[PDB]
């Protein structure tokens, strides 16, 4: 259903749902909320699952917020030292600008 | 004193004693004696000469090694390499978690290739999307027989495949006759497609967009570029 909601070009319903299944635990699923979005709040939770400031940085940096991820990372006694490619490079783009719909509701006919 | 003896011990001996050494907790030293690929390997896990462990791996000769190792590498946060091993493993799932977290297209192409590999429909889609590629998502659907669903995407974010696709879906339906089951129209009648005139296509927004895809949305960030995708987005998008 969530998928239907993201298919369609509108934003909330998925988010409450996201709340209500985030709230029902998770280790690989948060992902669903993030892409079609920019911003995620999941990160507040996420760090707790990870909490190695690593995820928090990778995620963090672009809202102009790499920084908190570093603060903890330091506090720990950091453990990061090498990284692989991953520089945001894939397009979270597509959906439905004016003319030629969405489909909340879909019309048809027996004919 | 022992060292003089040491020449005068070989293969297997080294192993036993190595275990003793290991018991001594003279792991490094235990490493020096080290004498079985397994033996070396486990110790290596404990030990973490990372590169060194790789050489022992050499050609690992078991993804299981890589899997085990991957967890370890990741712990050491020796990712550049980890990626190489994991990639070498091509063990997609864990590897995805990293790759995604910083984000990356390149990973995505190779992966796309992978995506094709995996054998359940769903992941591959996220990828296609993730990349931004309706086209890919839709092509994927063609193989799986996702047909109702494919239509929704084709509609929402318009590649107007809704017209193309709908005919085919309908055809299936058609096969399974009954007029209601057949179901029919694209520009006008049942559907009024382009005559409805509403929210998944056009040039101007699109032009702005054309660029948009190219820059980073911005708010304040890192070398790891911007795109956003929230309230603002909705507003311009309408424009």
Author numbering:
A (entry chain A): 703 to 813
B (entry chain C): 605 to 843
Q: What did the publication describing this PDB structure actually write?
A:
Coat protein 1 (COPI) coated vesicles function in retrograde trafficking between the Golgi apparatus and the Endoplasmic Reticulum (ER), and between the Golgi cisternae in both retrograde and anterograde directions. Coatomer (the COPI complex) is a heteroheptameric protein complex, consisting of α, β, β’, γ, δ, ε and ζ subunits. Arf1-GTP recruits the protein complex coatomer from the cytoplasm and anchors it at the membrane. Polymerization of coatomer at the membrane assembles the COPI coat, which recruits cargo molecules and membrane machinery to the assembly site.
To further investigate the regulation of Arf1 in the coat, we incubated COPI coated vesicles with ArfGAP1 or ArfGAP2 in the presence of a non-hydrolysable GTP analogue and determined their structures. We were unable to identify any ArfGAP1 bound to vesicles produced in the presence of GTPγS, while in vesicles incubated with ArfGAP2 we identified an additional density near the central γArf1 molecules in a subset of COPI leaves. No significant additional density was observed near the peripheral βArf1 molecules or at any other position in the structure. The size and shape of the additional mass corresponded very well to the catalytic domain of the ArfGAP2 protein, which we fitted into the density. In this structure, the catalytic domain of ArfGAP2 is positioned directly near the Arf1 nucleotide-site, where it can provide the Arginine ‘finger’ essential for stimulation of GTP-hydrolysis. The ArfGAP2 catalytic domain is bound into a niche in the assembled coat formed by Arf1, the γ- and β-COP adaptor subunits, and the β’-COP outer-coat subunit. Within a triad, an ArfGAP2-binding niche is formed by β’-COP and β-COP from one leaf and by γ-COP from a neighboring leaf, with the central γArf1 molecules at the bottom. Thus, the complete binding site for the ArfGAP2 catalytic domain is formed when the coat is assembled. This suggests a possible proofreading mechanism: ArfGAP2 recruitment, and the resulting GTP-hydrolysis and coat dissociation can only occur once the coat is assembled, minimizing premature dissociation of coatomer from the membrane. We were not able to resolve the C-terminal, non-catalytic part of ArfGAP2, known to be involved in coatomer binding via interactions with the γ-COP appendage domain, most likely because the non-catalytic part of the ArfGAP2 protein is largely disordered and may not form a globular domain that can be positioned at 12 Å resolution.
